[PDB]
Amino acid sequence: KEMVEANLRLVISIAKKYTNRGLQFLDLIQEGNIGLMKAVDKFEYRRGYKFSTYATWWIR
DNA sequence: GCCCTTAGCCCCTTGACAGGCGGGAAACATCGTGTTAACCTTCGATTAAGAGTCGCTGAGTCGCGACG
């Protein structure tokens, strides 16, 4: 939950390019939150430990 | 004029298909999942150039009195 709340701003930033695609902005954010929470379930110490890229891929 | 004999129509029995809904068996196009990890961790409209009224809130002005 801490990692999600400390990254939700990421989802907010990614949900700006999909605006006006059949879903509201907050709806898109709270839908991408599902993928974000699904990303933390599979997040190990692999190469490139930056969670930015992984989070943006899963929100997309 | 009535009875007998024979012909035509109606009805019954079988049947050789024809294919025809439909489940099965199969070959093939969906629909919900995952999974990848090289860089940005606040996006954006939209009234607001007429008009009669409902529902709430928060400032400045006064009484009643006590303690010197």
- Helix-, strand-, coil-residue percentages of chain A, each rounded to 5: 60, 0, 40
Contact A56, A14 (CB under 8 A): yes
Q: What is the largest CA-CA distance in chain A?
A: 36
Which nucleotide minimizes the distance between its C1' and the CA of A47? Answer: B37
Report chain B positions within 7 A of protein CB atoms. Answer: 34-44
Closest nucleotide to the alpha carbon of A51, via C1': B37
Q: Are A8 and A33 in contact (CB under 8 A)?
A: yes
Method: cryo-EM
The answer to whether the beta carbons of residues A29 and A12 sit under 8 Å apart is: yes
Question: In units of Å, what resolution does this entry have?
Answer: 3.8
The Cα–Cα gap between A50 and A41 comes to: 16
